[PDB]
Amino acid sequence: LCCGPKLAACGIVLSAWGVIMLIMLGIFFNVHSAVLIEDVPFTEKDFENGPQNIYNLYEQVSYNCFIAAGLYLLLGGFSFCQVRLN
Amino acid sequence: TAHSFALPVIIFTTFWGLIGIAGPWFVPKGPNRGVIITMLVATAVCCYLFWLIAILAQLNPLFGPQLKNETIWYVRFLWE
Amino acid sequence: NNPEYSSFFGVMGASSAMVFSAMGAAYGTAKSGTGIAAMSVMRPELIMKSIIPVVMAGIIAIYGLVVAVLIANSLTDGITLYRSFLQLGAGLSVGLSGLAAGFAIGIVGDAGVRGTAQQPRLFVGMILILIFAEVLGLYGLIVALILSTK
Amino acid sequence: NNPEYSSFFGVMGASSAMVFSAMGAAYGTAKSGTGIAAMSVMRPELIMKSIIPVVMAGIIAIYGLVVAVLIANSLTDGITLYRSFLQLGAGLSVGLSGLAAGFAIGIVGDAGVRGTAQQPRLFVGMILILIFAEVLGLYGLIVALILSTK
Amino acid sequence: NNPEYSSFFGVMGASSAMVFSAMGAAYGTAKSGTGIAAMSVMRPELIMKSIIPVVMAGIIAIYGLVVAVLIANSLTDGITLYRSFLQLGAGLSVGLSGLAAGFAIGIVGDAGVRGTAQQPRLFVGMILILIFAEVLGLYGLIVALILSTK
Amino acid sequence: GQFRVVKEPLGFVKVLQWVFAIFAFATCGSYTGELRLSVECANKTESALNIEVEFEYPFRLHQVYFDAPSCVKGGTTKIFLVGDYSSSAEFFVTVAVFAFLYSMGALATYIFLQNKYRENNKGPMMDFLATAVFAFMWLVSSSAWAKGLSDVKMATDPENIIKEMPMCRQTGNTCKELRDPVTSGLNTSVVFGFLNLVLWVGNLWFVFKETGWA
Amino acid sequence: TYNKTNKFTHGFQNIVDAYGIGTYREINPAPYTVITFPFLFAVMFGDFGHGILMTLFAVWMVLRESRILSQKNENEMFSMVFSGRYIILLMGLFSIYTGLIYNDCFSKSLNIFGSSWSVRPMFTIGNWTEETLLGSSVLQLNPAIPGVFGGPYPFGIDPIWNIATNKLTFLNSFKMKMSVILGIIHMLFGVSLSLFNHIYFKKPLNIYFGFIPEIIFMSSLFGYLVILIFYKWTAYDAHSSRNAPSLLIHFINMFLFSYPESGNAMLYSGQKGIQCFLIVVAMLCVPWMLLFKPLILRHQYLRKKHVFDFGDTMVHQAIHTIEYCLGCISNTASYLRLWALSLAHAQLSEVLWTMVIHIGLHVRSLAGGLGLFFIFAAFATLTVAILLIMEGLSAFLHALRLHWVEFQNKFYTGTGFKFLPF
Numbered sequence A: 001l002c003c004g005p006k007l008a009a010c011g012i013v014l015s016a017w018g019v020i021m022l023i024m025l026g027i028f029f030n031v032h033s034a035v036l037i038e039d040v041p042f043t044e045k046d047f048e049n050g051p052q053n054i055y056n057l058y059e060q061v062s063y064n065c066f067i068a069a070g071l072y073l074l075l076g077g078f079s080f081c082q083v084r085l086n
Numbered sequence B: 001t002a003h004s005f006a007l008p009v010i011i012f013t014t015f016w017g018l019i020g021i022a023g024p025w026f027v028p029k030g031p032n033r034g035v036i037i038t039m040l041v042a043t044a045v046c047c048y049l050f051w052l053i054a055i056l057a058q059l060n061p062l063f064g065p066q067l068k069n070e071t072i073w074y075v076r077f078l079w080e
Numbered sequence C, D, E: 001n002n003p004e005y006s007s008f009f010g011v012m013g014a015s016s017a018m019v020f021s022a023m024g025a026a027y028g029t030a031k032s033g034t035g036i037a038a039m040s041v042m043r044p045e046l047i048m049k050s051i052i053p054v055v056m057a058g059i060i061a062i063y064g065l066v067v068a069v070l071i072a073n074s075l076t077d078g079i080t081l082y083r084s085f086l087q088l089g090a091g092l093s094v095g096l097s098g099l100a101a102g103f104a105i106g107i108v109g110d111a112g113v114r115g116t117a118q119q120p121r122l123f124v125g126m127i128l129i130l131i132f133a134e135v136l137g138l139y140g141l142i143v144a145l146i147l148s149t150k
Numbered sequence F: 001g002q003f004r005v006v007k008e009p010l011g012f013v014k015v016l017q018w019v020f021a022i023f024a025f026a027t028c029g030s031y032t033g034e035l036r037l038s039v040e041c042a043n044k045t046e047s048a049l050n051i052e053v054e055f056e057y058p059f060r061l062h063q064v065y066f067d068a069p070s071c072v073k074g075g076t077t078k079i080f081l082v083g084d085y086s087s088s089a090e091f092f093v094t095v096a097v098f099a100f101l102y103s104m105g106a107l108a109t110y111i112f113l114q115n116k117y118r119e120n121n122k123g124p125m126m127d128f129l130a131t132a133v134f135a136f137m138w139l140v141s142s143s144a145w146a147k148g149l150s151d152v153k154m155a156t157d158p159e160n161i162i163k164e165m166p167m168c169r170q171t172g173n174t175c176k177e178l179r180d181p182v183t184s185g186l187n188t189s190v191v192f193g194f195l196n197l198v199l200w201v202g203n204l205w206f207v208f209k210e211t212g213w214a
Numbered sequence G: 001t002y003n004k005t006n007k008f009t010h011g012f013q014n015i016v017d018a019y020g021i022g023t024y025r026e027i028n029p030a031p032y033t034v035i036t037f038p039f040l041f042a043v044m045f046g047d048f049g050h051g052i053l054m055t056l057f058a059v060w061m062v063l064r065e066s067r068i069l070s071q072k073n074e075n076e077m078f079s080m081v082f083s084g085r086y087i088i089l090l091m092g093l094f095s096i097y098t099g100l101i102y103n104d105c106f107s108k109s110l111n112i113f114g115s116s117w118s119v120r121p122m123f124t125i126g127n128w129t130e131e132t133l134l135g136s137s138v139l140q141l142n143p144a145i146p147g148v149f150g151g152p153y154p155f156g157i158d159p160i161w162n163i164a165t166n167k168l169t170f171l172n173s174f175k176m177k178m179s180v181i182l183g184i185i186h187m188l189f190g191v192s193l194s195l196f197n198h199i200y201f202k203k204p205l206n207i208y209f210g211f212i213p214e215i216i217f218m219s220s221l222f223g224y225l226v227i228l229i230f231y232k233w234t235a236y237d238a239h240s241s242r243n244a245p246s247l248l249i250h251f252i253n254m255f256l257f258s259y260p261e262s263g264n265a266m267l268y269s270g271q272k273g274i275q276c277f278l279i280v281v282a283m284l285c286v287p288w289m290l291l292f293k294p295l296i297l298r299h300q301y302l303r304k305k306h307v308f309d310f311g312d313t314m315v316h317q318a319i320h321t322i323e324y325c326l327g328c329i330s331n332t333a334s335y336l337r338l339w340a341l342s343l344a345h346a347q348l349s350e351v352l353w354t355m356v357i358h359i360g361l362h363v364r365s366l367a368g369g370l371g372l373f374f375i376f377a378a379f380a381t382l383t384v385a386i387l388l389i390m391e392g393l394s395a396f397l398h399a400l401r402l403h404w405v406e407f408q409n410k411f412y413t414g415t416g417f418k419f420l421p422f
């Protein structure tokens, strides 16, 4: 699937940005950072007993971030293969 | 979480003073000695002023942060 | 027990539904009319084919009328203020959407009927634009119905 | 407590969302249409490629219809004045943002379709500007939703 | 406790923040667009360079959207008259500032696109003016952020 | 395989550095402490006769919490431990882990690629750089971890917890202790930290001799 | 005018030359601009993430500079950006620093040292209970009770303000004071450079009348304001919050001589007398500039040796004095542009985050990990389209404007010719 080198360069730079920033976001969520509390998809019931439920939700969002990072890793690999093609 | 205002002030003051005062004398002689020394001194002055303003604005607060009850509940458990 | 003035807004809706749309239609049937006449002097054979914008404008009026009749049938002596406001809003939506659609149809139809005398290939293009204008009135009607039958 | 007249504003929301947007779209469909009719006399081949401004005006009308129906499907009898004010604000935002976007699309699309007859390379340029106009309506829609679905 | 109409003004503020800003942006996106269409016939290579005014006009709209959202997310049912009128003031500030900034950007860009077509050296000059005009809208936004969070 | 290099004095030093700071990692990063207390209020039925809590190695004690008795109406109050010392414990454990990884790499190089290591005495040069860096790291971290262990003993001390407990400030309430954590693991960790400190201090001179600067 | 420009300093020399080539052998603003323009840009573009992106882009341009220099193209915008590759590199570095100071990274703080704000002392020493948390939607925090506020954050703004709804309340004051402080200090540095100019050109008349009145006026009126800002920061605390005066009202009263017996008390003992003395010196600095120099020029060039036209000289000096006196005020006001642009950038980044990637992060199901893909791309492009390119351009041009007008008006003339060799 040959394409213009400019698009491949944009794809690889976006892939690097996504991988780095989403890996950092996943690490920060998994650390249960309070700064990102607003992004955690919790509900009222989660404030019943203790913070363990919110910790689990933090971990779930971190897993989502890592999945996004992996998808962007695949995208960057595709872009690098296209660059090697060109 | 007692952030004493002695280690930060001493450390940053001495660091930026060494960069802005001691730094110029260590710049190797050459065509760019003057511009490099100006860069050193100006960076020291600007960065130290910015950090000093930032730290002093927080010293002696006249009111505390307004935190939602959800984030207050979380912060009680999490933060020190 | 409902306010005696509640029906007022209702009738306004109906009246508006048939006035503004009519006004819009008039503009259409006016502007296109002129264009058609200006075209007929040179290319008479395009008269019938060029009556399309007028028809479009006419359809806009129909929308208005339809909604008006709807409202004009949903009026009752004890019509609640909520339903009266709903009918007024439906009338406003249909009437003013038909007004804007009629203005657009008039302008586009005049321009396209004048052009089709010079470039026949423009005919189809004009038609598309007219539809894109006509649908505007349709949208109003849709919303009107949603408000009127709510 | 939930006055008898609370629904009025909400209704005037839906109508607004459908009316003003339509007006904007009509303008976008009208002005652009004239330009196409002017351009197509000399450059027939660009007539179909140059209908994009009309499509964008229609999309503005679709934004208006979306918000108008989303409001009309939330007008309960005892709608609180707060919710009715929210619906009026959403309708005004979507409708008048769509009106401004319709003005912008009309001017830009007409100028671009007439210029593209001279310099084809302007086409892409025009499209970009049209997008920058279209997003304006989109912005309104966004805010409208944020108000209406609140 | 608080009047049942207290939420009206704030809502209008939000809508105003979206509407007037959009209008401003629209005018810009129109005027600059016209200028580009006039320039691009002789100097096609400058279309991308000369699209900066439109972008700045778009930025104005964004500011309004921001404030609108910032007000549309803060409207509570028991919104006091104090908060309601704070949000109204923020909305008026951002909306009218964006309107004026959009007018200035449109006029200056419509002049400067043609000027840069004539004299390339004016390009940077045009920009040096546009940003000034743009920040006028920004100033409004700033005051809005001061008000709606007072 | 240049296994004889392992048997050399510097090979022995590297092996010891490998096995130690693995002992420290196992003893510190694997620590899990437990505290048990009891309270007999004025009303015996409201007594918290058995309260149990558990904490882990990172010593983020301020997060650790438990529902102590209120001694009034049978209610409970949430109480959190005082302060954390992860700044010291994590620092020490990371230092030990880095030492273990570097020692494993150095042992592999000595066994397989000692010729390249000794080439130009540059391998010894980076060895001396790392030796000085690790000596400074151990010097700071051993003291940091010792102070952290002392403060841990103070804070986790059920006596201090009860001292800060507002229960004893009421009438009749008696708060007493039931268990104490195992302090052998942390003392062993600090002892092994000092052992690693002295090991790297000795390695300084050996690397100096190898690099030819002696 | 010949400056012996270098590869690194070419960007800044062209930047300072755009408003007018400096006269023959006058204090060049290029060496000081090399740092104060990236810094005044970072004060507005303060963001760790956007600073990182800008630094990486500028480093890419620098490393591959030879390739693009060889491979020339006609893209005016790219050529302009590339010519300022070093300017952009320095701007990115200083923006990284300021974003660290602002504790901002894509609109999110860091908390690498630990916040000074503990909520537990509210529950322990304060009256709070879980009931109060349940009953209050937003509540607040107070440092008056002992353990809530454990000193200032060692480096940069405390992270808690990111999650505090009182964020803007504090940040507006902090950034307004920062902008005014930096502006006044920059203008004072400009006036000192004007003194250097006068000394080199051997114009003692300007030194004794001119520079000295200018510096006395500026320092007494506005340097005193910086002193007041710093003193209020050091002195008033949470306990004395109730009677903490507003420096805006105090400055206005100083100008109006409206020291009242009611309202906020004096910042310090003897404020009335000291402020009256400062105001008197400030006004006297006006006649000092206006009347003196024309009279001495007339005396020494029309009474001695005997075209000089006293009326026009007096008019010109009056225009210069009016310009400078109104300029001090209008420039101290204009330097608030730093706070305005910084707050706008911060709020636009915040709204972009919460409107784009809050959608992808606020999803319970694991399938959201796929959504975060597409959403993120939009975020990324937006952060490159609105923030990095447009807000960055605005901040760049406004730092430029601050340097051209507010800073260089104190010492720069710019009435020379560029040295165009053969």
Ligand SMILES: CCCCCCCCCCCCCCCCCC(=O)OC[C@H](COP(=O)([O-])OCC[N+](C)(C)C)OC(=O)CCCCCCCCCCCCCCCCC
Pocket: E124, E127, G010, G011, G012, G014, G015, G018, G053, G054, G057, G077, G078, G080, G081, G082, G083, G084, G087, G088, G384, G388, G389, G390, G392, G393, G396, G397
């Ligand atoms: C991934 C994205 C990361 C972010 C990167 C972008 C950051 C946003 C801000 C960039 C602004 C760039 C402008 C400054 C650089 C030019 C200054 C310089 O050194 O050149 C002296 C320039 C051009 O160089 P010159 O040709 O005069 O060089 C001197 C040559 N002799 C001596 C022979 C005459 O000279 C001037 O005219 C001086 C005044 C410049 C004032 C700048 C006006 C604004 C320009 C806007 C640029 C375009 C917008 C960005 C578009 C990006 C999309 C492609």
Ligand SMILES: CCCCCCCCCCCCCCCCCCCC(=O)O[C@H](COC(=O)CCCCCCCCCCCCCC)COP(=O)(O)OCCN
Pocket: B024, B033, B034, B035, B037, B038, B041, B042, B043, B045, B046, B049, G032, G036, G185, G186, G189
């Ligand atoms: C309250 C906060 C603000 C405070 C700001 C003012 C205080 C800082 C500046 C005070 C003055 C510093 C010293 C002035 C220069 C003295 C000359 C000797 C300097 C030196 O050792 O380097 C020479 C080169 O210097 C040179 O080439 C010139 C060096 C110039 C240094 C000063 C420039 C930075 C000032 C801007 C500050 C930042 C902005 C503030 C908002 C070497 O001698 P040589 O052999 O090179 O011979 C000279 C020409 N070649």
Ligand SMILES: CCCCCCCCCCCCCCCCCCCC(=O)O[C@H](COC(=O)CCCCCCCCCCCCCC)COP(=O)(O)OCCN
Pocket: B019, B032, B035, B036, B039, B040, B043, B044, B047, G006, G007, G008, G009, G090, G093, G094, G096, G097
């Ligand atoms: C992230 C937190 C920190 C942010 C704040 C600090 C930011 C500092 C930014 C300056 C650093 C980058 C300098 C440019 C690097 C590229 C070099 C370009 C070429 C070069 O060597 O330039 C020379 C000019 O001096 C120079 O290039 C100057 C180099 C020495 C500068 C010393 C001052 C640095 C700042 C203070 C110390 C560090 C503080 C932070 C810890 C002369 O060009 P040439 O002769 O090579 O040209 C060859 C053709 N003629």
Ligand SMILES: CCCCCCCCCCCCCCCCCCCC(=O)O[C@H](COC(=O)CCCCCCCCCCCCCC)COP(=O)(O)OCCN
Pocket: C012, C015, C016, C019, C020
């Ligand atoms: C359901 C639908 C909604 C129901 C509610 C609406 C009820 C009906 C009332 C609205 C008006 C209906 C009548 C239509 C007016 C036709 C306008 C024609 C405009 C026109 O061409 O006239 C221009 C003058 O404008 C004018 O003179 C403007 C028109 C005159 C004003 C009309 C109002 C009269 C005042 C009312 C008094 C009572 C108020 C209550 C106390 C002349 O154009 P040019 O300037 O180029 O001339 C140059 C050549 N001569």
Ligand SMILES: CCCCCCCCCCCCCCCCCCCC(=O)O[C@H](COC(=O)CCCCCCCCCCCCCC)COP(=O)(O)OCCN
Pocket: G188, G192, G215, G219, G220, G222, G223, G224, G227, G228, G231, G235, G267, G268, G269, G270, G274
């Ligand atoms: C090129 C650079 C150009 C210059 C740029 C800087 C701007 C200069 C501005 C004018 C000169 C300096 C400022 C003079 C105005 C008074 C300053 C007062 C500062 C202040 O708040 O201090 C408090 C008053 O001090 C006292 O209680 C002591 C008595 C009152 C103050 C006496 C005068 C001190 C300043 C001496 C001149 C410095 C000249 C600097 C250029 C501390 O007092 P507290 O809080 O402990 O007491 C309070 C309960 N009683």
Ligand SMILES: CCCCCCCCCCCCCCCCCC(=O)OC[C@@H](O)COP(=O)(O)OCC[N+](C)(C)C
Pocket: A013, A016, A017, A020, A021, A024, A025, A027, A028, A031, A032, A033, A034, A035, A036, B078, B079, G049, G052, G053, G056, G105, G106, G108, G109, G110, G111, G112, G113, G114, G115
């Ligand atoms: C294209 C080029 C590449 C671009 C690169 C961009 C990189 C951007 C990545 C980051 C973006 C997201 C920012 C979010 C930052 C918040 C994370 C945070 O707060 O961190 C710290 C938390 O982990 C801990 O804090 P805590 O648990 O609350 O407190 C405990 C803290 N003690 C232990 C120090 C007391």
Ligand SMILES: CC(C)CCC[C@@H](C)[C@H]1CC[C@H]2[C@@H]3CC=C4C[C@@H](O)CC[C@]4(C)[C@H]3CC[C@]12C
Pocket: C062, C063, C066, C070, C145, C149
């Ligand atoms: C088709 C042209 C002539 C335009 C006129 C449209 C007329 C004939 C038709 C088309 C759509 C129809 C409406 C479609 C839906 C509704 C809502 C439903 O609950 C009852 C009837 C009602 C209100 C219909 C009435 C008649 C109607 C308005």
Ligand SMILES: CC(C)CCC[C@@H](C)[C@H]1CC[C@H]2[C@@H]3CC=C4C[C@@H](O)CC[C@]4(C)[C@H]3CC[C@]12C
Pocket: C062, C065, C066, C069, C070, C073, C074
């Ligand atoms: C040109 C013509 C064919 C267009 C369509 C006819 C329109 C104008 C009229 C004629 C008869 C009308 C219907 C007659 C009776 C009723 C029942 C009433 O409870 C609701 C409105 C409703 C359903 C009317 C809707 C509008 C209607 C369909």
Ligand SMILES: CC(C)CCC[C@@H](C)[C@H]1CC[C@H]2[C@@H]3CC=C4C[C@@H](O)CC[C@]4(C)[C@H]3CC[C@]12C
Pocket: C138, C141, C142, C145, C146, C149, C150
């Ligand atoms: C191509 C067709 C479907 C559209 C053109 C005709 C329009 C006017 C008609 C066709 C079907 C109609 C809908 C059918 C049913 C209802 C449900 C009723 O409670 C509100 C009105 C509403 C929502 C009608 C609105 C008007 C409507 C959309």
Ligand SMILES: CC(C)CCC[C@@H](C)[C@H]1CC[C@H]2[C@@H]3CC=C4C[C@@H](O)CC[C@]4(C)[C@H]3CC[C@]12C
Pocket: C142, C146, D069, D073
């Ligand atoms: C059918 C295709 C061609 C669409 C053409 C017209 C569009 C605008 C019309 C046709 C059918 C309409 C829908 C029919 C029924 C309902 C439910 C009703 O409570 C209100 C709105 C809603 C959801 C309508 C929205 C508008 C609608 C989608």
Ligand SMILES: CC(C)CCC[C@@H](C)[C@H]1CC[C@H]2[C@@H]3CC=C4C[C@@H](O)CC[C@]4(C)[C@H]3CC[C@]12C
Pocket: D062, D065, D066, D067, D069, D070, D073
């Ligand atoms: C003729 C065509 C092009 C008209 C536009 C397309 C129509 C079919 C679609 C597009 C998006 C749709 C809207 C999307 C969401 C909602 C919200 C829901 O609560 C009521 C229906 C409503 C408001 C829909 C009505 C029909 C709608 C407007």
Ligand SMILES: *[C@@H]1O[C@H](CO)[C@@H](O)[C@H](O)[C@H]1NC(C)=O
Pocket: G125, G126, G127
């Ligand atoms: C109650 O509240 C006041 C005001 O915040 C506080 O100062 C005081 O210490 C509290 N008293 C208690 C909890 O007894």
